[PDB]
């Protein structure tokens, strides 16, 4: 796992150095960075094409301490066309993303061939100080990545979407 | 040296963290009189050198592959000891 | 018994640097914050800054960002404040007070002659009254403070004394005539029977989450 | 009828008979489940198989279902004399906004 | 659990009718409702569907019956209403109301109401 | 130096702990033959210097404010690595 | 977080020293001390006035290894005046306080305006080697605090209480 | 010195482990495209010296008594920091 | 807890040495070794006589990283003679043993006087990278032990069993 | 009647009407929930709103409730012709040993 | 779920009566029972309440009816009994027995028994 | 929950009979079934038991009735069938069918069918 060290205001990748100073655990920091900063498309039809359903892979949750303000967040309440639930319920201790300028709440029906929804690019779904590989029902999340560093010594708008055929190439919104 | 290969980098970083245990507090440290779960965040803005921010975003991109493999190997549902292991590895390597 | 001892009166030139001392005893020095308050003659109380004996963390007010520096000595349990470029308007009485367990300036030392911030404002400045009347003092907070509002009484020639903390709790030994109540943004301090010894200046200070612990404007009876 | 089924299936008693349901990428290739219904003459349809292969409680184990590609099959291990009824396969279509699609209808006759 | 259907009769083409299904033994407000019709000597045909109140209570209709049929539900009375307008000869079929009360897939089908449209 | 500000201090300390893994045991280390959940505690009495006991009670009073802030920052429901972090901080500070 | 070091039979607060010896993790110890030793009132009407209900604050649990014998312990089975439950069920792994000379079992009805009951003085509710910030239904607990140290190199009586208007200033017992 | 007191020792050791995070991987590190839970194991055979294998089996026999007592003392349902504590104890003892 | 160090291809028990090298956490390894290697009886009637039911002892789970191929594994679905369940359900995150040449699936009825089934010899029940002191319902497990080391710098057959009077001396199979 | 309610409330069809329930510190200021009941003439009361603002299943969304200080209010967004019934607010009193307290009773007439 | 009430009649002042409510469709032993009376052309008045057996099965009465009315429950028969003694003219009201079987607040109210006390 | 029994009558020794129990209000497929007979003026005697389909649906019989009685269940019809062959004089008893629907031990016992075998 790569470790970042900030030297003379320049970030470097850790490699024995004998010149880096680490005297407390407060210097170690985990930061969750959103994918919107990288310039990816934040549109709802574009974002949903990066998520897929699979079975046999247990979900995993990692912890991060510092986050980034998100201009776009997603909330999913998707059911099967017969009324049965598609996404699992959020476990105890997992909450929505705290800072979200816009929350895209998407609801409707569509096929769900897997127990959990993963990210096709391998990214994580950021939650309140927790990053998970799967999407939980009715919880605000942001897509992003987590980095580890050695530190040197609010209004939200909700948008409603109605999607049919979610997870396919024939998905109609509103 | 870290080279940012992302098509676009955001020069600004609006971050939220949690108050340190050693910070100045009054009566709010009591959970009964403390703020709600949404009022325990400290905000800030980093308008520092653009190279540090873009390099930080690139570093998180490269960490994804190693982190995904680590999570697959582990069997615990939630992992909180990633930084503790890093400190042990750092201290074992230094040996002083 | 908590006791705070400071240095004596010091006279300085119009241009010089001076240092003040504050010796505390009777409690664990490193477990409580130390605050410094400046009071001009005939004026109110001005909060300078706070210094934490543990981890050395310090905070300062906007007006005293560069005028004062705070240092402590754990071995001697003494807190020091250093003033640079003492102008003609720096001649004032300086107090050092201990931040309470729940955040109250409960103990004060004797005087030494030389946006995002919650602002507490009192409705009036002078409240004339007679003996036997029921006077009420109102303190207004810009933001939401649950109960964390403290009331202080300062008589002529004496250091301020804490009377009510958490807006309801009464310090032991304070006469029962003093009663406080309130929550949210409006707080009231009432005296059931005003006597001849109640003539003083009363201040309200909030102690909920804001490092700039600013005092009120004061109210003279 | 979006789905395609044989017009009729007949077999000797005690043998194994199969009914084939034919769909497409939008119907079955998109991941939608295939539901099998049995309708006795003059009665309401009964859901023999839900999901893809699961069976509701109170249904004999003789009825089994499987999914392969864009087609689904219903297998009856024991062809009893009480199985003479119409069989339908129902799924969902990605097009037409997740509307129900039914098969033509297969009539089973026991020899 | 039981569903009872009523409201069928002989109506000339161009008339209107209202079909009602009564639900008992389960929570009607938390279950999706579907209408399926079967022509005499033909296969099953899906008519429409209405979702639960928590899901917005939207109604979807099949293409042949789109723009002419209206489906509504009464949560207080635990009843499902289907309003049929501009009836044609091809609409002569036996209508069924279907729902799922437990998501282990225990489904309930009504007896069926025969509607005959002839002149 | 710790000054006990509590109105009353109990000079005696009746404590209960758990048996060490290196203690002398027979067949009871097997869970099938071991004692119940209520029989795994070792009792004792500390009639030592009163200053140590009163100072211990005062120390726990002062730790409450820092501990409450630490728990609020964390997101895990149960915390078991408080002492492990202290050992790492102690070893990092010593550097030998 | 303060750390206590025992030197020459005198407890001191940790501050670099280079004279303290720590050669094993067995020296590190967490001790839960009850509030009854400090002289607080152990009466049931007095104790219940230090507990309040609040919503929006997630519960937190910390671990301690050594405990203190408690002369007074409390067990709460409180419901709303309409019969609905007021306190949450104890999770798996949480048990009652092991050593309790007296157990004050309080039951009855009263308002519960919050999801969880906290301690107004910021103390913890001690359980079997676990300290929590909230009260769980039908579990014996003691109110106390936790300290961290560097170590140098049974009959119970149950009392029944019936309380109406629990958590107010008009509460009647028995 | 470890003496194997078991009546029978198996000289061969067919072991299964998990791939290291630093191993060579292609597209399978993505959980969406990765293998199932049963395809994340690396197999191997150890036909090395018989003394090492028999001594390893005897060592696990002796560890049972100490491990059972340790688990009884702890209150957490699942334990994952056994090796982390060993590293801290090793580093504290070395002091350099 | 004993710790094994491999020196000159010889395993030794750790005792200050100043000659052992530990420079990373990858050297530390926990290995779960099956009891079949020690020569114990793998027969179903013999294996079930080493398991007993007890109440009052909470279950405990430990973690191991490396395992051993098992030639015999057991799956238990045991109920009381009245139809009620006997073994607890496996919690989330616990799976069957991955490598099993033979899986002996035992089902039937028998008395269960305890909440959990333990091992009379003090061994563990190995699961997928988890070792537990109890048996979970419908999960493949192997009986074995766990060791800690400092490293130097597939087809399965299922067999059906019907047992009556499980856990006694009058148990009949098939 | 410990709680106070208006003797009668009238409004035009399709409009929004509000019914006010007045309590005290012991009744509502102590944190006790306020329950709203609807009683058609000759029938048993029906619980329109439980808790403070929650609504039981099978109840139209037109009925809504809120709590402010020591008083509670019931709001009906749509004044249908079937709402002509008596409305009562029920809570609990800290005094009198958690006894039920009912309002005077508000009669709703649709214009 | 259904509650059936019986035991009402015209009784002269100073007499005694016993009202019974029958419970079905839910566990009677785990539900609290309440008695509410409504005078003709008046508001609802709370009479009394009995708690579950697990809660001790205590009974609480309103001040006007305290010392004269007794409420008892039969867990075996799933029936609730209200014993009224020293009836007065002001006691003429329609009594109701109320309970909650599911704590998602699905309540059940009885039809109501009219008791007339006149001379 | 209710169990209804039928199929009893006067049969000469050496005859055959079939007893049926009807189940309602609970899932019949997930509950074990037992047969208990009681001779006139005697104690209860266990006849046999059949397990659920998920448990393999095996049948166990008592020694006196082993080899002569057969027990079968119909999951579709929610009915339990007991086939009796080679009846004797000692078989004259009142048969009961027992099951447990909720594993908090809420059991259901049938009314009882009297079978008389006399010549
Ligand atoms: C650690 O130990 C300290 C003690 O050193 C604990 O402090 C205790 O805090 C609680 C909560 O605030 C106090 O209870 C409240 O007391 C007020 C009245 O307080 C006045 O009178 C006291 C004598 O009765 C006196 O000791 C107080 O002086 C203390 O405080 C001042 C200012 O902070 C400080 O300078 C002193 O040195 C003292 O420390 C003060 O003069 C009382 O009004 C309160 O009652 C209200 O609130 C309760 C709910 O809490 C409610 O039920 C009531 O109905 C009423 O509404 C409340 O009782 C307690 O007095 C303090 N202890 C002492 C000895 O004073 C601290 O809590 C410990 N930490 C823990 C346990 O984590
Ligand atoms: C969706 O993909 C299928 C192939 O899987 C293709 O046949 C179909 O035309 C596609 N539909 C759209 C709308 O792109
Ligand atoms: C309870 O507190 C309220 C609010 O301060 C007050 O009005 C009331 O009189 C108090 N009652 C008692 C019995 O103290
Ligand atoms: C089983 O054990 C009991 C108790 O020791 C004993 O009485 C009985 O004889 C044993 N039966 C057999 C078959 O060993």
TrEMBL record, chains B, F, H:
Compartments where located: Host cell membrane; Secreted; Virion membrane
Domain of life according to the entry: Viruses
Cystine pairs: 9-54
Positions of the Envelope glycoprotein GP2-like HR1-HR2 domain: 13-93
Coiled-coil residue windows: none
Function: Functions as a decoy for anti-GP1,2 antibodies thereby contributing to viral immune evasion. Interacts and activates host macrophages and dendritic cells inducing up-regulation of cytokine transcription. This effect is mediated throught activation of host TLR4. Acts as a class I viral fusion protein. Under the current model, the protein has at least 3 conformational states: pre-fusion native state, pre-hairpin intermediate state, and post-fusion hairpin state. During viral and target cell membrane fusion, the coiled coil regions (heptad repeats) assume a trimer-of-hairpins structure, positioning the fusion peptide in close proximity to the C-terminal region of the ectodomain. The formation of this structure appears to drive apposition and subsequent fusion of viral and target cell membranes.
Quaternary structure and partners: Interacts with host entry receptor NPC1. GP1 and GP2delta are part of GP1,2delta soluble complexes released by ectodomain shedding.
Family of the protein in this entry: Belongs to the filoviruses glycoprotein family.
Name of this chain's protein: Envelope glycoprotein
Species, as recorded: Ebola virus
Full-sequence range covered: 503 to 598 of 676
């Amino acid at each position: 796992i790569p470790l970042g060290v900030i030297h003379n205001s320049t970030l470097q990748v850790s490699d024995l150095v004998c010149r880096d100073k680490l005297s407390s655990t407060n210097q170690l920091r985990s930061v969750g960075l959103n994918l919107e900063g990288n310039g990816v498309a934040t549109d709802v039809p574009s974002a949903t094409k990066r998520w897929g359903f699979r079975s046999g892979v247990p979900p995993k949750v990692v912890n991060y301490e510092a986050g980034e303000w998100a201009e776009n967040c997603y909330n999913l309440e998707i059911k099967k066309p017969d009324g049965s639930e598609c996404l699992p319920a959020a476990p105890d201790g997992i909450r929505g993303f705290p800072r979200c300028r816009y929350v895209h709440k998407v609801s409707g029906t569509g096929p769900c061939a897997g127990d959990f929804a993963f990210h096709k690019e391998g990214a994580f779904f950021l939650y309140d100080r927790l990053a998970s590989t799967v999407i939980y029902r009715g919880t605000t999340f942001a897509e992003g990545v987590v980095a580890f560093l050695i530190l040197p010594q609010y209004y939200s708008t909700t948008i409603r979407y109605q999607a049919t055929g979610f997870g396919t190439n024939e998905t109609e919104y509103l | 040296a870290i080279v940012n290969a992302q098509p676009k980098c955001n020069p600004n970083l609006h971050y939220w963290t949690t108050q340190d245990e050693g910070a100045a507090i009054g009566l709010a440290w009591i959970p009964y009189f403390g703020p709600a779960a949404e009022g325990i965040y400290t905000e800030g803005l980093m308008h520092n050198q653009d190279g540090l921010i873009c390099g930080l975003r690139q570093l998180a991109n490269e960490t994804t592959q190693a982190l995904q493999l680590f999570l697959r190997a582990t069997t615990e549902l939630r992992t909180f000891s990633i930084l503790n292991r890093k400190a042990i590895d750092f201290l074992l390597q230094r040996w002083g | 018994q908590v006791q705070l001892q400071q240095s004596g009166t010091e006279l300085v030139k119009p241009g010089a640097s001076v240092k003040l001392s504050c010796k505390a005893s009777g409690y664990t020095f490193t477990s409580y914050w130390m605050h410094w308050v400046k009071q001009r003659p005939g004026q109110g109380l001005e909060w300078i800054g706070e210094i934490n004996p543990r981890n050395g963390r310090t905070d300062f007010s906007e007006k005293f960002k560069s005028k004062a520096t705070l240092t402590v000595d754990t071995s001697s349990s003494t807190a020091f404040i250093q003033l640079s470029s003492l102008t003609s308007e720096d001649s004032a009485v300086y107090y050092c007070a201990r931040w309470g367990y729940y955040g109250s300036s409960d103990y004060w030392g004797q005087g030494t002659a030389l946006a995002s911030d919650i602002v507490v404002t009192q409705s009036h400045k002078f409240m004339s009254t007679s003996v036997g009347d029921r006077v009420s003092i109102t303190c207004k907070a810009s933001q939401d403070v649950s109960v964390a509002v403290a009331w202080y009484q300062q008589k002529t020639g004496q250091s301020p004394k804490l009377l009510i903390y958490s807006a309801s709790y009464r310090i032991t030994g304070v006469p029962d005539r003093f009663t406080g109540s309130g929550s949210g943004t409006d707080f009231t301090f009432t005296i059931s029977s005003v006597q001849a010894e109640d003539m003083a200046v009363y201040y309200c200070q909030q102690h909920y989450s804001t490092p700039p612990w600013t005092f009120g404007g004061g109210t003279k009876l | 009828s979006v789905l395609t089924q044989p017009p009729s299936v007949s077999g000797a008693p005690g043998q194994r008979v199969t009914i084939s349901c034919t769909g497409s990428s939008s119907n079955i290739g998109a991941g939608y489940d295939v539901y099998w219904y049995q309708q006795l003459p003059g009665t309401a349809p009964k859901l023999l198989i839900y999901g893809n292969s699961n069976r509701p409680s109170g249904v004999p184990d003789r009825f089994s279902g499987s999914k392969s590609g864009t087609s689904a099959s219903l297998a009856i291990t024991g062809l009893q004399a009480e199985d003479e009824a119409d069989y339908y396969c129902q799924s969902f279509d990605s097009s037409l906004r997740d509307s129900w699609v039914f098969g033509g209808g297969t009539k089973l006759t026991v020899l | 659990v039981q569903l009872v259907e009523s409201g069928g009769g002989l109506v000339k083409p161009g008339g209107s009718l209202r079909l009602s299904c009564a639900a008992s033994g389960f929570t009607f407000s938390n279950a999706w409702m579907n209408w399926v019709r079967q022509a005499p000597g033909k296969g099953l045909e899906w008519v429409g569907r209405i979702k639960s109140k928590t899901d917005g209570g939207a109604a979807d209709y099949a293409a042949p019956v789109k723009g002419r049929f209206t489906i509504s539900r009464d949560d207080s009375k635990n009843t499902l209403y289907l309003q049929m307008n501009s009836l044609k000869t091809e609409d002569t079929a036996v209508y069924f109301c279907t729902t799922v009360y437990r998501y282990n897939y225990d489904s309930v089908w009504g007896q069926g109401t025969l509607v005959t449209v002839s002149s």
